[PDB]
Each structure stands twice: as structure tokens, then as C-alpha cells.
Amino acid sequence: SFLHIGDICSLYAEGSTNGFISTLGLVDDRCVVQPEAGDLNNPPKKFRDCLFKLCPMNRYSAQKQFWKASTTDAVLLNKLHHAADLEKKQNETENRKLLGTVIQYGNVIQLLHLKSNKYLTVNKRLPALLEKNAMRVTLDEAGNEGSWFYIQPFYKLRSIGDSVVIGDKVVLNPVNAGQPLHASSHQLVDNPGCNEVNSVNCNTSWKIVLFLEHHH
Numbered sequence: 001s002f003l004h005i006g007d008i009c010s011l012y013a014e015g016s017t018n019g020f021i022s023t024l025g026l027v028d029d030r031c032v033v034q035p036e037a038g039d040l041n042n043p044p045k046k047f048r049d050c051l052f053k054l055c056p057m058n059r060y061s062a063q064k065q066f067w068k069a070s071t072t073d074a075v076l077l078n079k080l081h082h083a084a085d086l087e088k089k090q091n092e093t094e095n096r097k098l099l100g101t102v103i104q105y106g107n108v109i110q111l112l113h114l115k116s117n118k119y120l121t122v123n124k125r126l127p128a129l130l131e132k133n134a135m136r137v138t139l140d141e142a143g144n145e146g147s148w149f150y151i152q153p154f155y156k157l158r159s160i161g162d163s164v165v166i167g168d169k170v171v172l173n174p175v176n177a178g179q180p181l182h183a184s185s186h187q188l189v190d191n192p193g194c195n196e197v198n199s200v201n202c203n204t205s206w207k208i209v210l211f212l213e214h215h216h
Helices: 063-070 074-097
Strands: 008-014 017-025 029-032 052-053 109-111 117-126 135-140 149-153 170-175 183-186 195-199 205-214
Touching: 029 135, 052 170, 063 149
Parallel strands: none
Antiparallel strands: 008 017, 008 052, 008 205, 017 029, 029 195, 052 109, 109 117, 109 149, 117 135, 135 195, 149 170, 170 205, 183 195
């Protein structure tokens, strides 16, 4: 039972705080873990909100150049706009070819939160809202380089190059945005009950729990 691009899973954190990554609405871009909401044997009531789709690494170079422009030249801006469209089209095409391919440890993936249709994203230039020395994690619709994560093995049963097995505990390590995804114990003031997910050197493990195979 291996994990594939296109599979839909939930991510269960095991750390100082245990729980599935979830969100706080369609507008609020904060990611959290609610320990009391549920666990592996007793999953939370709103599980629709804990679902992520495993996606390939999107190209963002042309998009970034365009977003960046800024610029006064309309001719240039149109060339960049076109290039960004060709890039988005290439992601669409290539990502379709990758559907159903097995994910190997060391691969770069993106995590699409299905309910909000946004990617889990690390912001290398922003501190987390609560945990001081950590970097901020947010939900971003288009995503960016901060949405790129290496999926690495938490334990040595499997190594880089091996297929990721369902139920495996992994490290979600940003490619260049910062440190591993962390399930902190920093409780949100406004909410219960919810603890901040951020990016910082940590020992959190993330268990990949399969919900639906890609072909569905």
C-alpha cells in the first residue's frame, strides 16, 4: 500500500501535541492541530477539513517574475504574463501525467488542502504568529516555492529512494523556505483548543493516513 500523487490523505502529527492538521475557515489562512478534536483511533468530527491531496512540484519561476511586475513597460508585462500562463499550463499538463505515480522518499511534493483549495505554504520571510523563532505557515491558493516540501523518512525502516508506504511517519521539509513542519504547543488565543502549525527545527512526525486513492 503505497502513497501516490493524487492520493487524498490526512496528516496526523505526533509531537508535544498530537492531532490532524486542519484549518479555521475559508478566509483564515492559519493551520492548526486540535489534539482534543480527535486522534488516530478517534478521528475528529469535521474530517472533511483534514483532507489533503498529494501534488507534484509546481514550477513558479515565470509566475514569480510576473507577480513581481514593479514595471512600467506594458510590452514587458505582457511577455511575462504570457510566460506565466505557459508555465501554469505546463504544470497542469505534467501534473496530469504524474497522477497515480508512486511517491519516493526525497521527492518534492505540495499539499493541497481540499476544502479551501489552497496549498500548505511556508513563508521564509515571516515569523510565525505565536512561536517566535519559527517561520509562518499559511494556506495559499496559487502556492509558491514555499509550498514545496521534501517528503523524508522519520525512521529508518525506509530510506531516500524507497516508495512511501501508507501509514508511514514522515518529515515535511521545505525545499528552501525553511525548517520542517512543526506541530507546536502554542495555543491560539482566539480559538480553543487549537495549536499553531509552523516551520522550525523540530522532532514532529507526520503520519500519512490514506483516505481515498487517486483514481477516485
